[PDB]
Backbone:
DNA sequence: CTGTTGCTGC
DNA sequence: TAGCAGCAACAG
């Protein structure tokens, strides 16, 4: 009864969606009957209608499961069409001789929900000898809809649990493919993809290629301005919407609520650049309900198939929907928008493109630059208008024109952020990923890898693995593992200092490294022609000229091996390092074989070449307790009694063995933490064990073929990109002469390039995606250890011919002598020039001689299972630079460097890279950010090293004066701003219980002072100052929310008194509250790491005497 | 000395 | 629902 009721409820929701879709122009098109011969070559005679699939969703049709497909379509404004398809999954059998006994059992056991059954065959890469065409026999179960499929899973799961813990029932091994989403199933099984064009026909969807450009959907982008209380956040229960700003296809609009906005706003232009027009037409509406009705009316009129917002999943749409509910409007019946199971806002016809999702995932912006202004500055390259949130509600009455200018600025910023970056990126991803735009924007990158691998496995008739479930506990040497992993990317900080293209450095070249390079030179130059440039040496007219020029420079560096000359500042980095290690070594999770599976394989003979053995470094963190002590703790817990977690059970108490195995292990881990601390005084030993695994080269190539093929398609688009770049400049300059179609397609191929790029680097990660399928914790360890070995080999050469400064995973930063052999050009007989970078090609040659896979096997004849063996290697360094300067900081500790922080400057004086520093990080003490933001460029001043340290000393002394002067030389608003430290709490304050930190204390005090609403959401920005005047107290106990300094005087007083424990305090000036010694020590630290200690290591005497060296360093300097 | 956590690395 | 290595503040 409940399943019919649920199917009727789903049909009633599907009818409401059909009514809404028809209101928005998405009438359900059914194609004409065509009894002719189906050939996709004669598509124009083929019947029905061609369209580009813009939006797809799972539906229930008169219920039968189907997918509705929404076609921005060519020509048309839009039309939907439906594909019906039976939901299915598989049963696996342990004995293939008795499949018919299992078939009869499941027909009779699933009769209440099963539509049909069929025996099929699939390749299973875990089956012994599948590489001979042996396929696993499977029972396909098909259903009328997804609800009946879910009931069959509820009936089968008890049999699998009985079989695993304790007759044709015991022949059921597992259920396979039971957890594929239904729209993803239809998209894979029919090869239909959003962003791709299709002709909708009776037989299904036929992809079209004569059309690579996207259609132009109607794109709306909006933002909302709300009332708020002072120092608090707008509450949709009490606060009103003041204005809604939006853009539609490049026209601007503003709706204003005249209960709140004091004047009628006139039509105006906000064009922040000539490439971002914004003409705003104004709707001055009488009240908040007229504002909401106008907004819903205008959405129905223009029929947007995309609505974009900035963070509107979590502010804008929640606010509009709650205000609509207060006024008795149903936003779902008005415009088709509702919150989903995640609380994100979605419709059928229109995709919701929250730009903040792309900003968080894909923009590559650090979390400190992920707010709208900093995204606009970093992507659109202008400053939007900026208003203080505390001035918004006053300015609705005092200056509403300046509030409307701010609101239209955030609509313009959101619209052009969407159209220049999010739109081309997401629809390009949809052309390859079996997901709609909303899922393609919002799912994690490792889920996008899962979908691509599921397409490729399906196309090769491979059986999908079930999702990996982490074991609840594991043991190593009788110790309970807290966690296991591998040794990841290798990282070194070798030197610290300022390095400049115009300042001299000492070099001590190893003459034996130059002898190796002179002996390798002929084959390294041949390798650069044949492998890097894919040409033949016979075509190169000047090969011996370039060889002799490099030979002379090398001989001069061998004879004069101790030099003091200018540097060349270079970065050498491995192109797509982990993907290229994976393709080179044929690394997948489809091959890592045990000695058993390798022994069971008919290709395992004397002389076998196909078993490539590779090393990895496993890392345990396990409890110091042994298996006897674990068993003693388990026996102790078996005598205890536990509360029943299931509120629906009348049984309030359970024994240990009546708990779930996950709950048993949670209780074991708790008592083991106490026992380990009591007996061993310490908690998590860590150990690194080098392990070996067997990489099959003969195993079915579907994973690696996806990677090779994807890599080549990306290279393809980089090439096409370059050809298009030539096309965009070769031609005439009449910009409007039907060549703006050519430039959008340039953005498009760039976007498909960036798309394959993210997909590849993701495959590289996905493979450690806990809970994902095709997981391969090993494979990941081999990839990292192979990479660590490559980069240490490269460093060990660069250290012998120059000085490596920093090493991070795939990249080495180094200085070479300015006399070093650098860039050259080979001349072909056809007058074309090939590029040579000798510092790059000398590394690439050594990578190819040491890391090539001479065991790579590929299947030449699929009928006879004949494999060819060849030599594969795709691991190349690229070179970036040279540079004008590089500045590396040093640690406060003796003999230690700082990794992952540096600044680099281009020849033109501009900043090329800034890594890691507080300036870039979200949050952080603002004084430190403003400091770093002053100092780095000042390293380009002076003519000597000492003059350069002097110029930066002076900036240090300016900043030290501000703190020694206790800020007096500073405006009071500017002071609060500078001394503020801002830190995000990733959760809510409740979830931090028994922890301490400045954020926690700031949040608690904000709560007490401004109310519990302040801390109910996650992501709270805790802005605080550290207190103290002539005394002292605990750090995390001394964070004061800077907001208190804007409270009414009696409030401020009561709280600062509490927080400082001073009943009788009268002085409420921030300046007497602040702990100046704390801030001088934080700034001192920065000055040490970036300026004084590195100065010392370059033998320059303390350029900032007001900051004293630590003792070890003072001591260092005695002779 | 370790261990926790935020935001970066690359 | 991608991974590991690292800086550094603050507690113990
Ligand atoms: S190494 Fe050869 S014999 Fe062993 S599992 Fe792989 S393909 Fe089969």
Residues:
């Amino acid at each position: 009864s409940n399943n019919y009721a649920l199917s009727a409820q789903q049909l009633l929701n599907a009818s409401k969606i059909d009514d809404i879709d028809s209101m928005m122009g998405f009438e359900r098109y059914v194609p004409p009957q065509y009894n002719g011969r189906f050939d996709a070559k004669d598509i124009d005679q083929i019947p029905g209608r061609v369209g580009w699939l813009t939006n797809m969703h799972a539906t229930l049709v008169s219920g039968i499961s189907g997918v509705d497909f929404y076609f921005l379509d060519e020509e048309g404004g839009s039309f939907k069409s439906t594909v019906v398809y039976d939901p299915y999954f598989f049963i696996a059998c342990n004995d293939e001789s008795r499949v018919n006994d299992v078939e009869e059992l499941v027909k009779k056991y699933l009769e209440s929900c099963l539509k049909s059954l069929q025996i099929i065959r699939k390749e299973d890469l875990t089956m012994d000898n599948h590489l001979l065409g042996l396929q696993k026999t499977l029972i396909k179960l098909s259903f009328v809809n997804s609800n009946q499929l879910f009931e069959a899973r509820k009936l089968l799961r008890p049999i699998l649990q009985d079989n695993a813990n304790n007759d044709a029932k015991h022949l059921i091994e597992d259920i396979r493919e039971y957890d594929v989403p239904y729209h993803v199933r239809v998209s894979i099984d029919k090869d239909i993809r959003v962003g791709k064009w299709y002709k909708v026909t009776q037989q299904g969807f036929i992809e079209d290629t004569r059309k690579i450009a996207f259609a132009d959907p109607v794109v709306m982008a909006f933002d909302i301005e709300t009332t708020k209380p002072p120092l608090k956040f707008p509450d949709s229960a009490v606060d009103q919407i003041m204005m809604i700003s939006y853009m539609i296809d490049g026209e601007g609009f503003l709706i204003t609520n005249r209960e709140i906005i004091s004047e009628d706003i006139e039509d105006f232009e906000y064009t922040p650049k000539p490439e971002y027009p914004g003409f705003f037409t104004i709707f001055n509406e009488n009240d908040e309900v007229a504002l909401l009705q106008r907004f819903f009316e205008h959405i129905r009129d223009v029929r947007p198939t995309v609505i974009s917002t900035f963070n509107g999943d979590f502010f804008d749409w929640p606010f509009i929907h709650n205000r609509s509910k207060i006024h008795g409007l149903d936003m779902f019946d008005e415009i088709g928008f509702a919150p989903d199971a995640e609380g994100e806002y979605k419709s059928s016809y229109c995709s919701h493109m929250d730009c903040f999702r792309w900003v968080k995932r894909d923009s590559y912006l650090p979390q400190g630059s992920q707010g709208l202004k900093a995204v606009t500055q970093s992507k659109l390259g202008y400053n939007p208008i900026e208003l203080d949130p505390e001035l918004m509600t006053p300015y609705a009455f005092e200056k509403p024109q300046h509030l409307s200018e701010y609101s239209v600025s955030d609509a313009v910023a959101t619209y052009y952020l969407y159209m220049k970056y999010v739109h081309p990126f997401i629809f390009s991803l949809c052309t390859i990923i079996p997901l709609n735009p909303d899922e393609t924007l919002r799912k994690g990158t490792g889920t996008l890898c899962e979908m691509l691998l599921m397409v490729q496995a399906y196309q090769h008739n491979i059986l999908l693995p079930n999702k990996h479930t982490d074991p609840i506990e594991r043991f190593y040497d009788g110790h309970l593992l807290e966690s296991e992993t591998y040794v990841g990317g290798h990282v070194e900080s070798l030197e610290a200092g300022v390095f400049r293209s115009d300042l001299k450095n000492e070099f001590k070249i190893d003459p034996s490294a130059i002898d190796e390079l002179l002996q390798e030179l002929p084959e390294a130059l041949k390798f650069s022609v044949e492998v890097e440039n894919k040409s033949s040496v016979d075509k190169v007219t000047n090969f011996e000229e370039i060889k002799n020029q490099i030979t002379q420079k090398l001989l001069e560096l061998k004879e004069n091996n101790i030099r003091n000359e200018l540097p060349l500042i270079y970065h050498v980095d491995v192109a797509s390092m982990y993907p290229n290690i994976m393709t080179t070594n044929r690394l997948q999770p489809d091959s890592i074989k045990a000695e058993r599976d390798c022994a069971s394989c008919d290709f395992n003979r004397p002389g076998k070449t196909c078993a490539r053995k590779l090393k990895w470094a496993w890392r345990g963190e396990f409890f110091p307790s042994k298996m006897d002590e674990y068993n003693m703790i388990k026996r102790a817990l078996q005598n205890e009694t536990f509360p029943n977690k299931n509120k629906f059970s009348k049984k309030k108490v359970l024994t240990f063995d009546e708990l779930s195995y996950a709950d048993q292990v949670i209780h074991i881990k708790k008592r083991l933490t106490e026992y380990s601390r009591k007996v061993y005084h310490r908690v998590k030993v860590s150990e690194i064990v080098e392990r070996e695994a067997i990489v099959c080269q003969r195993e079915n190539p579907f994973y690696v073929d996806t990677v090779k093929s994807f890599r080549d398609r990306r290279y393809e688009f980089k090439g096409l990109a370059k050809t298009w770049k030539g096309n965009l400049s070769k031609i005439d300059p009449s910009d409007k002469h039907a060549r703006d179609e050519a430039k959008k397609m340039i953005v498009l191929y760039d976007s498909l390039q960036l798309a394959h790029k993210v997909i590849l680097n993701s495959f590289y990660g996905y493979v450690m995606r806990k809970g994902s399928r095709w997981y391969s914790m090993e494979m990941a360890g081999i990839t990292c250890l192979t990479g660590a070995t490559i980069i240490q080999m490269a460093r060990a050469l660069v250290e012998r011919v120059g000085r490596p400064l920093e090493l991070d995973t795939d990249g080495i930063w180094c200085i070479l002598p300015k006399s070093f052999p650098e860039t050259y050009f080979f001349t072909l007989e056809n007058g074309k020039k090939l590029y040579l970078s000798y510092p790059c090609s000398m590394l690439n040659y050594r990578v190819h001689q040491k890391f090539t896979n001479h065991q790579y096997q590929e299947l030449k004849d699929p009928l006879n299972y004949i494999y060819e063996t060849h030599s594969e290697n795709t691991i190349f360094f690229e070179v970036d630079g040279p540079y004008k300067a590089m500045i590396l900081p040093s640690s406060k500790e003796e003999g230690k460097g700082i990794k992952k922080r540096y600044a680099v400057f281009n020849e033109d004086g501009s900043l090329a890279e800034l890594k890691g520093f507080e300036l870039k990080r979200r949050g952080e003490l603002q004084l430190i950010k403003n400091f770093q933001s002053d100092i780095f460029k000042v390293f380009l001043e002076g003519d000597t090293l000492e003059g350069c340290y002097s110029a930066v000393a002076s900036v240090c002394n300016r900043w030290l004066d501000v703190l020694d002067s206790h800020g007096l030389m500073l405006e009071d608003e500017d002071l609060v701003s500078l001394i503020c430290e801002n830190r995000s709490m990733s959760k809510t304050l409740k979830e931090y219980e028994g922890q301490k930190s400045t954020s926690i204390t700031t949040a608690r005090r904000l709560g007490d002072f401004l109310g519990e609403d302040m801390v109910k959401d996650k992501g709270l920005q805790c802005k605080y100052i550290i207190s103290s005047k002539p005394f002292n107290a605990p750090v995390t106990e001394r964070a004061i929310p800077v907001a208190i300094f804007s409270a009414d005087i009696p409030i401020k007083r009561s709280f600062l008194r509490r927080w400082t424990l001073d009943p009788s305090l009268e002085d409420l000036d921030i300046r007497t509250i602040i702990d100046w010694g704390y801030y001088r020590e934080r700034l001192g630290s920065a000055i040490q790491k970036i300026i004084t200690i590195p100065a010392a290591l370059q033998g320059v005497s303390n350029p900032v005497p007001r900051v004293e060296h630590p003792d070890w360093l003072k001591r260092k300097i005695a002779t």
Q: What stands out?
A: Residues 366-368, 489, 491, 573, 577, 682-684, 808-811, 899-901, 915-916, 920-924, 983-986, 995, 997, 999 of chain A lie near DNA strand B (CB under 10 Å from a C1'). The pocket of iron/sulfur cluster is lined by residues A 593, 597-598, 601, 603-604, 608, 610-611, 696, 698 (CB under 6 Å).
